[PDB]
Each structure stands twice: as structure tokens, then as C-alpha cells.
Symmetry: C2
Subunit: 413 residues, 2 copies
């Protein structure tokens, strides 16, 4: 709904301004880089650069970035996913200059020293060690994508394999950074109470001078997942866990597909909200699961509709899967009430306008669509969403929720 | 009883192994082993080790493309090649009179092979055909490939040496030149000569053609570091293919690396379970119940963490799950320790006969040495026969219960 103005610099750095209205803004730097741009053996680098991006540059010390942003009362965070690496500072419009100055300092001026690479690697090694190896939901998450994808880089989670992390080199990281953190592969997004013309010329002051690597184009990943040809399963026995978990995922179209809208709605009906089907049946009523939810991941390439449930003590994961399937079979039968379709539709209207208030929520929307160049899909989202009928939620259900596209993972003691 | 040998390492790190056979006349085999396979590849650039097999018979400094074969055939020789997970292997079958020319031809392709773009481009289309025909559109081939995709997740054994189609499709000449010049160094190669020929003649002739060949640099060949995590439970995958009509099954159990002590028992287990016309899979699945048209086992002795593999293709109107239910029932029967003394004895008497039959053929002896040389495990090879004949039933049952657990099982169904 909100209007936007975009301009492209001579180096390829796309600048996008979204005027919003109380001085509060968020300045984003997006990199069209994810773990999907990695290769098995040298994975996890996409996430490693997130840690390294806040290290010493030419004019900044090893922690000077996080200290300068703290000085004008701003907040800074960063995240790397499958398809995008995103940095952002949320502050007032008064600090729009220094924020752009800071981000430019880390783009075309960032140097990765050895005495910074070594200490940070063993840190990420611990992040792998304690958030995937010795973590219930984390291990299930990683092992699922190991099973659901065989060839495409979605074979692994942005954290990457442990041995990969252990065998990184400074050269490997510099090559990955220099190639993928080029101005041509980046986007500057500013959202909040700021002037679009003011943002453009001020972005030019810090980014027009920065240059790219060569003239060649960014290497495009070619590892396309072959169509899934039947159910894949994997059971994971791991000491350290006590409860029994299960992940059920169905193969789902790429980002720009028309059916992604109905899927998003299916997620909010099945396992998203205090009144979802999973929460009501498995958690509330039958009390089989302590936690149960769904998430229609909107990955750039061939994505996946994900179910995750961690049952109560002494409850097998085969019972969880059997009951989730039971719900899905009731779904494919067309058992959706008008009230359910209505409640999800009115809750979407509510959640939408609530996000238009905060600049941080708005920038999150565009960021996911800017990197895909599907802004037209963003603007037409609500109109296509509210015009959804039960027929649409059932067509999509019977379309992608087949066992032949299913990937099931059991987590047992 | 195993043939004595003499080894010599050249100044460039090339190993030369001569295995004379007096009880043979004229016939020899000239082997060139490269310590390279699909295990030295990376996903995105897989199947390259196999591509090099095709390109190895193209033009060199002195030879035109295919002139290698023409020359070999001219002196009535036979030259085959094969790439596996761990080892790339070339050999010429001929007489000792052609030992010199054979060594010349192999030196001609080792440190003198030029990889022209006009040779790489058409040959890739060929190996692209080899992929679609014998994997993308082949029952046993697709099953073989999809199995290793499931059984292994991280280690390069995730794929068979044919590689992924898109990998093949996205190769570059630079990629292949990098791979070849790195992995086909003399320091990474072994020249093996078996048959009726003098060792000192083998050495001086190999020194003649290979001693002057240079390496790429001084730093050692990169060792793969992607070790497969211990399998933490059963893994399954169903493959629906249009071309198929009968249902197939692949049941594999994780197994120790090449140089392990239990490998001999594993070999013995395969001899008992699914090899020969007297195996359990034959006279129970194929014969007594007529459930499968084909059924066999293979203890793959891969360099890194290996796999014991059961493969069965059912008769019409027989589901793949029915095949799995039966082979498991055999394994449970096996794990109960139900092996007759008569059964164990038949395995040992057949192993004797095959061994003495192999000592008569230079081709057989070469094949034995080739696998153990690339692993530097000749001691294991010599000690094999005695270890095999000292196997008790208990050894077979211990090894069975040790590795044939569902938590290390990988199962792939081929439908419809
Ligand atoms: Zn992190
Ligand atoms: Zn989304
Ligand atoms: Zn071939
Ligand atoms: Zn063997």
C-alpha cells in the first residue's frame, strides 16, 4: 500500500526509499546472497560474513560499529537466511547520514584480517556446536533439509556443516565476500519518516564512489532440485534429548508462484495462531504435543511447506505424524468452514495495518520482495489474499500435500 | 602363496610395482593407477574424475585423438579403463614384447595430455548421454544413484562417479584442466606391471618413460575432509519412475572403512547372502519363493566409511516392500546365528578355488593389487587368505549383528 521511489546508481547499487511519520526510520542494506550461493564443503560462509561484517574496516575498529550506533541511541541487527543477507539500523531521521556512512564503511572498505578470522571461526563453531548439534529443534531443522533436498544448496541450513566451518580459509572468505558483497549485488532500503529525494543524494555521497570487482556478472547457482519422486524419511537418534520430535515437509513452488498466497493462508489456518488446527487438536484437545506449528517458507527457489511438532513426554513421533496427516486429510476433503476462512481473512487485515505503523515491519516486507524483484507481487498481495475462497485452499492442499512430495524426520532419544 | 613383488619409488614420487609370474608365458598387463575418484570431487563439480577417463584417450603431444587405441589394437593389445569412488584405473592387455610401447603410451597421456576445447565440448555431450541412458533412464542405475544420495549426506559418496546432470552440464574446460593437472601428477600415480616379465626390465623401462615427468608443485595432494557423521537412524526414499515396470529395492547398511579387520568377514557374509547360485538371496527369494527376478549383495570395500549393499528386483505384481520384508527376515535369521558348518565350509572351499584360479591370470592378480596398492595395504592383501580361512561362524554372526542394524540402514524403493 505505501508508495515507494527507487533509483539505481552507476555501479548497480539499487537505492529504494519508502516514505512513511514521526521521525522514526530504518536504514537497510540488503545483499542478494544466502546459503543458496554456497557449495558443500565451503558452506556456512554466508553466515560467517555476518559476524565479520561488524569487524574492523579502514576507519572502524573491531567493535567501533556497534559502539557508534549505540551512541546515537540506535539499534542494529543482522540476519542471514537461505536467499538473502540483511543488515539494518533502526533509528531517527537525524542519524540517517552517519548510518549510511557506517554501512558504506563496511561494504567497499571492509578488510578481513587473520587475527579476526581465527577467533570468530571457533565462535561460529560453538554456535554450530550448541545451536544445531546439542539442540532439539536445531538438529531437526538441519537434518530435515538434508533429507528434503539432495542436490540444491537447500541441502543445508545457513549454519552449514561443522567440518566445513573447521576447514575454512581466509582466502575462501575473501573470495566469497569480494564476489557477493559487490555494490551491484546490494540494495539500500530506507523506510520511515524521511524524504526520498534526500535519501537518494545522501546515499550517493557514500556509495557512488564505491566500485565493483570486475565487469562480469554474478555467478548464478545452477543446481536445480530434481522433482521429488516419492516420500523421503530419516530418523535421528540423539543423546541429550528426552522428548520426541517430528518434522513433516511438503515440496512447494518457488517465490513468485501464484499459489504462495493460498499457502501463506494455509499456514495461518493449520499451525499459526492460538486458534490453529494443530494448536487446538494436538496441543489443546488431544494434548499429544507440547509445541506444534506450521510455516510456509517462501524460499527463492523451490521451497517447502513445513510442519514441526515436539510431543509431550512418552509420546511417539509416529503418533504425531499420523495426527498431522489426519488433519491434512480432513483438509484435502475440503472441511473448511466459512468462519475459519473469514477469521483468517479478518486477522490478515489486522496484522497488515499493524505493520504499516512501524517502519521496521514495513522494511521487512519490501526487503524480501526487493531481492526477488517482485514488488508487483507485494502490492497485489492483499487483493489476491482477501479474494481467496475455500476452493483455493483445497486446490493447493491436494496439489502439494502429497506423500510423494513429503519429507518426514523423526527425532528420538 | 600370493605372488612376490618388487616396489620402487621414482624421483617424482611415482610408485612402480612389478609382479612377475613365471607360471605364465608372454602375457602381461600394464597398469596405471591414479589415486583419484568421485570422492575427490565436490557437489556442483561432480563426475569430473569420470570425464577424465574419456578425455585420457584424446590427443597428446605426439598422439592424435584415438591414436592411443589404434596403436594398442595394432599390436593386438586390449586397453580398458574404469573410474570408481576412490581409484581411477587404466590398463593394457598384451605381451612383454609390447611392454615398452605400452609404457610409452601411458607416459604420453600422463604428463603430456593436452585438453583441447574442441575435444572437451563434444565429449561432454557423450557423457551427458551416458548419464541419461544409464542413470536417468535405467532401473538399476537410478536405484544405485538415489541410494547413495540417501545413505550419505555430507561425504562425497553422496553421489556415484557419474555425477549430477547439471554438474555435467555446467563443467568448464578450466575446471577439468584444474582437476586433471592436480590429481594426475606422478606423485599421485602408480605404474603396475603384472605377468611374465623381469622386474629390473619393468623398472628401467618405467624409469625410461616416467622418471623425467614433472609434478605441478611441492605441496601435497588435498585430502578430503568431509567425513560422514555417524548414521543416527534409518533413512528411506521412494523413487517413482515412468520407465520402470518391476519394483526394485536397495537395502544398505553402513560399514567400516577399507583397511578394517571386519572387511574379510563382510566379504564372507556377501559370499553367503547374495553371491553365487547357492546364496541365500538366490535359493530363497528367486528360487524357493520366486519373488525376485534378481537378488544379490555386495560388500563394497570403499576407502572411507563404506556400505554393505542388498539389491533385489521383484517379479511382476510383487511390491518392493515384500522384498524388504524377506531380506530383513533373512538378516534376523542370520543374526540369530543360523549358519551351518556346511555353509561356512562351502564359502571357504570356493574362496580357495577362486584364489588359485586368479594366480594363473595376470588380469586377476593386477585387479587384486590395484585395490590394495592405492590404499597402501599390501600387508592386508597378503594376510587375506589366512584370515578368511580362519573365520568362524561366530565371526560372521558378530559382524552381522554389529552393522546390520536398522539405525545404519538405508532403504530405497523403485516404483511403479
Ligand atoms: Zn548467527
Ligand atoms: Zn513470507
Ligand atoms: Zn563411462
Ligand atoms: Zn572388495
Amino acid at each position: 500500500l505505501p508508495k515507494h521511489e527507487s533509483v539505481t546508481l552507476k555501479n548497480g547499487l539499487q537505492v529504494v526509499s519508502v516514505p512513511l511519520k514521526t521521525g522514526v526510520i530504518e536504514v537497510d542494506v540488503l545483499y542478494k546472497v544466502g546459503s543458496r550461493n554456497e557449495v558443500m564443503g565451503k558452506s556456512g560462509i554466508a553466515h560467517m560474513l555476518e559476524h565479520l561484517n561488524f569487524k574492523s574496516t579502514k576507519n572502524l575498529k573491531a567493535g567501533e560499529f556497534d559502539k557508534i550506533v549505540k551512541r546515537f541511541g540506535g539499534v542494529s541487527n543482522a540476519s542471514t537466511s537461505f536467499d538473502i543477507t540483511r543488515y539494518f539500523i533502526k533509528t531517527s531521521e537525524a542519524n540517517l547520514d552517519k548510518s549510511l556512512e557506517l554501512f558504506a564503511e563496511t561494504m567497499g572498505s571492509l578488510n578481513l584480517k587473520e587475527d579476526e578470522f581465527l577467533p570468530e571461526r571457533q565462535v561460529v563453531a560453538e554456535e554450530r556446536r550448541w545451536r544445531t548439534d546439542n539442540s532439539p529443534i536445531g538438529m531437526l531443522y538441519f537434518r530435515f533439509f538434508n533429507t528434503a533436498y539432495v542436490y540444491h544448496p537447500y541441502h543445508w541450513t545457513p549454519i552449514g556443516f561443522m567440518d566445513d566451518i573447521q576447514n575454512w580459509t581466509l582466502k575462501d572468505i575473501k573470495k566469497f565476500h569480494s564476489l557477493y558483497y559487490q555494490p551491484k549485488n546490494a540494495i539500500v532500503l530506507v523506510v520511515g519518516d524521511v524524504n526520498s529525494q534526500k535519501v537518494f543524494e545522501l546515499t550517493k555521497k557514500h556509495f557512488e564512489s564505491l566500485k565493483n570487482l570486475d565487469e562480469k556478472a554474478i555467478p548464478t547457482p545452477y543446481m536445480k532440485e530434481p522433482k521429488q519422486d516419492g516420500a523421503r524419511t530419516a530418523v535421528v537418534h540423539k543423546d541429550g534429548v528426552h522428548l520426541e520430535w517430528v518434522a513433516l515437509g511438503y515440496k512447494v513452488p518457488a517465490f513468485k508462484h501464484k499459489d504462495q498466497v493460498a499457502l501463506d493462508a494455509l499456514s495461518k489456518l493449520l499451525g499459526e495462531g492460538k486458534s490453529s488446527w494443530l494448536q487446538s487438536e494436538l496441543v489443546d484437545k488431544k494434548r499429544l504435543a507440547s509445541q506444534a506449528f506450521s510455516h510456509n517458507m517462501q524460499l527463492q527457489d523451490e521451497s517447502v511447506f513445513l510442519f514441526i511438532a515436539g510431543g509431550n513426554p512418552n509420546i511417539k513421533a509416529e503418533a504425531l505424524q499420523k495426527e498431522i496427516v489426519a488433519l491434512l486429510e480432513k483438509l484435502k476433503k475440503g472441511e473448511i468452514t466459512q468462519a475459519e476462512l473469514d477469521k483468517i481473512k479478518i486477522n490478515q487485515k489486522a496484522d497488515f495495518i499493524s505493520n504499516l505503523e512501524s517502519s521496521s515491519d514495513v522494511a521487512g516486507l519490501f526487503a524480501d520482495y526487493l531481492v526477488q524483484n517482485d514488488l508487483q507481487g507485494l502490492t497485489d498481495y492483499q487483493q489476491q489474499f482477501l479474494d481467496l475462497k475455500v476452493s483455493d485452499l483445497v486446490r493447493v492442499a491436494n496439489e502439494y500435500f502429497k506423500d510423494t512430495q513429503s519429507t518426514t524426520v523423526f527425532l528420538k532419544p
